[PDB]
């Protein structure tokens, strides 16, 4: 099992112009180890489709060309203003990735819950995501 974690911040989140189905992309990161597989995270600030229009969507994508099908479990969390993990969603098992394949959660968090300052999920209008992946 190859375990790797990535912390990424989206600045000025309440200012994001992406309409439904449009994507904010993280930097490309790496699972290190043997194969140096490359990955990215993709965020739909206003959902992926009309079914998810009230939600932020979050997906893990395999960027590089693997030598074979990759199986990975993943967990996505939001880091709150105090720095603690909250609002986690995790895959119940490993999912199968090829180059260009994404897996994630179309309904990761409700937008209005996310934007409410009383919930402490956007300190200084920054959304910090914490992605943990185990390639099995």
């Amino acid at each position: 099992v190859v375990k790797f974690s990535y912390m990424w911040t989206i600045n000025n989140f309440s200012f994001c112009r992406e309409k439904m189905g449009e994507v904010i992309k993280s930097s490309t990161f790496s699972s290190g180890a043997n194969d140096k597989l490359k990955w990215c995270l993709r965020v739909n600030p206003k959902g992926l489709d009309e079914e998810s229009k009230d939600y932020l969507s979050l997906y893990l994508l395999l960027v590089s060309c693997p030598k074979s099908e990759v199986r990975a479990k993943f967990k996505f969390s939001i880091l709150n203003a105090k720095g603690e993990e909250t609002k986690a969603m995790e895959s119940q098992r490993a999912y199968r990735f090829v180059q260009g394949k994404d897996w994630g959660f179309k309904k990761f968090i409700r937008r209005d819950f996310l934007l409410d300052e009383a919930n402490g999920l956007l300190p200084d209008d920054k959304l910090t995501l914490f992605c943990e992946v185990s390639v099995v």
Partner: peptide, 7 residues
């Protein structure tokens, strides 16, 4: 349950 945007 995770979902994908792909075949």
């Amino acid at each position: 349950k995770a979902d994908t945007t792909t075949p």
